[PDB]
Design a protein around this ligand. Structure first.
Ligand SMILES: *CC(=O)NCC1CCN(C(=O)C2(Nc3ccccc3)CCNCC2)CC1
Ligand SMILES: *CC(=O)NCC1CCN(C(=O)C2(Nc3ccccc3)CCNCC2)CC1
Ligand SMILES: [Mg+2]
Ligand SMILES: [Mg+2]
Ligand SMILES: [Mg+2]
Ligand SMILES: [Mg+2]
Lengths: 236, 5, 236, 5
């Protein structure tokens, strides 16, 4: 690790600076360094880790979709042959994306998940594990595609089971997990009914628990509830 | 594309 | 060069794909590879090169300004000491920026400028040389700061002298050069009057030559004339 | 910040 010589606190400080500067690749590298110190992450630190990689992989996924679209068009009838370049460059971006996903999955496996005993931390990491397997699934086309999809499903399901037992239906982690697992069902598992059912039930159960919340908690929960509604609107 | 967090 | 094994045409094709995917670091690497094949660039290829590096360095400059602002605030009275991290991370971004500038200046020196005989190509490259010395000047604080500033000035002045002799006052390259040299005067050389005079004279001389243009040329020229006006509005 | 191209 190129970050092995830097203090944990300095890596966290720099991650925050990198965020302010919209330098998400640097932010992710700093957070990887922090994780690799081997201490558990606080809530704030878990959020820095997730923001960093979400932004990096988000950019890769957007690029991959642009390139995949061009490639798909090149394989329509009447399309002029332009050689291997579009495929090569899509493969290049794809490989980089896979690399980032493998890096995140690696941090989760060594050793964030196994050390996470509190529900909020364990659910957060298992949601991340489902998310990064989901990104792998989006680009998977070969022998392991079903196993990649199942790895996402398994991680999300474990997270769901803990979240339903240990957290209130308005908990933002529980909500965000449900949002993303619903998208997994719709976009990856070819299960739009499961996606819709999950989003609806999650929204309605949260609605019924809002009365217990402070103004600030209410704000946090309703923000994610609106994303559930936005998806339901898209799908129905 | 649907929302995720 | 990691691009040494790829065909020139394939590098150009991939630069265009990278642009579509907003992958400007890749775009710049592809264009560096293309330049390093040692053939002159066409007009379209010169524009790919400039777009790629402008976007890369533009992002670095924005980040550097965010970090420099934080650093400057940390050195005000009553500011709590937070250690070396802000300076270190500003230095890191700064060094990367300098590296990109040195890379571009290197391509121009080896051997784009010396092979550029037509006015449009020579002015384009010398404008780029002024621009990348200007970015070096923005972060320069030491013994060589005056020489960096003079290197920008010298390149812009050579470009200006050729452009006035060989190109019409509406030529977009001539206009863009004047725009940027005007900003050099205002922001780098502490010469706001020179900046204003240059922008005004350039705008007025272009206005008087618009009658000679097609609709498409008129569109190209007026777009850059509006940037001159925007700056004049900012400065007066 | 002023415009450049
Ligand atoms: C305490 C802890 O472990 N995490 C804090 C939570 C995650 C961040 N958060 C959010 O509402 C956003 N992000 C996520 C929500 C749910 C799961 C993962 C991430 C919602 C989207 N905007 C950014 C913050 C608050 C609770
Ligand atoms: C033929 C040739 O060598 N170059 C084409 C010119 C540069 C691109 N261009 C422009 O108007 C934009 N960029 C630049 C203008 C002037 C100098 C350098 C770059 C103007 C800003 N939007 C992108 C194109 C047309 C002529
Ligand atoms: Mg592949
Ligand atoms: Mg159910
Ligand atoms: Mg320095
Ligand atoms: Mg004059």
């Amino acid at each position: 690790g190129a970050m092995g010589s830097m203090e944990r606190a300095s890596l966290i400080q720099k991650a925050k600076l990198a965020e302010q500067a919209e330098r998400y690749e640097d932010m992710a590298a700093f957070m990887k360094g922090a994780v690799e110190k081997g201490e558990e992450l606080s809530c704030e630190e878990r959020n820095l880790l997730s923001v960093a990689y979400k932004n990096v992989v988000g950019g890769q996924r957007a690029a991959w979709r642009v390139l995949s679209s061009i490639e798909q068009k090149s394989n329509e009838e009447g399309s002029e042959e332009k050689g291997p370049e579009v495929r090569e460059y899509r493969e290049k971006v794809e490989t980089e994306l896979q690399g980032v996903c493998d890096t995140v999955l690696g941090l989760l496996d060594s050793h964030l998940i196994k050390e996470a005993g509190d529900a909020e931390s364990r659910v957060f990491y298992l949601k991340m594990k489902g998310d990064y397997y989901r990104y792998l699934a989006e680009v998977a086309t070969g022998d392991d595609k079903k196993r990649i999809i199942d790895s996402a499903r398994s991680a999300y399901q474990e997270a769901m089971d803990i979240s339903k037992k240990e957290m209130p239906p308005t908990n933002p982690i529980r909500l965000g997990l449900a949002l993303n697992f619903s998208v997994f069902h719709y976009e990856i598992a070819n299960s739009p009914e499961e996606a819709i059912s999950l989003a609806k039930t999650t929204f309605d159960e949260a609605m019924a628990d809002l009365h217990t919340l402070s103004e600030d908690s209410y704000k946090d929960s309703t923000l994610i509830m609106q994303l559930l509604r936005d998806n339901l609107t898209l799908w129905t | 594309f649907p929302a995720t967090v």
